[PDB]
Amino acid sequence: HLNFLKKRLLQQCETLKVPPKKMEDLTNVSSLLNMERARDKANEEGLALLQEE
């Protein structure tokens, strides 16, 4: 039953229609997001220091 449900869901999602878009792979989203926060903090503090000067 689970295999039948899985294959039918594959058929349904293949038949499905969506507006065009670009998506990055699900496995690596977390790490890249973490480095993005790190870059966020570094650039924020740098800009704040420059503005203060």
Binding site: L47, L50, Q51, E53
Partner: protein
């Protein structure tokens, strides 16, 4: 963008400093010149009056 603003304001300050430095000095001898001149005039007048 902000880095360039920092650089150019630094240039501004670096150029402005000598002008104030010169102006303060000039005023400094000008005032003393006036005071010494008035003192000398008073002294010469007094000595001339005394001798007369």
């Amino acid at each position: 963008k902000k880095r360039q603003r920092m650089i150019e304001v630094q240039d501004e300050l670096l150029r402005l400093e000598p002008q104030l430095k010169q102006l303060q000095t000039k005023y400094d001898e000008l005032k003393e010149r006036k005071s010494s001149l008035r003192n000398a005039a008073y002294f010469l007048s007094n000595l001339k009056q005394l001798y007369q």
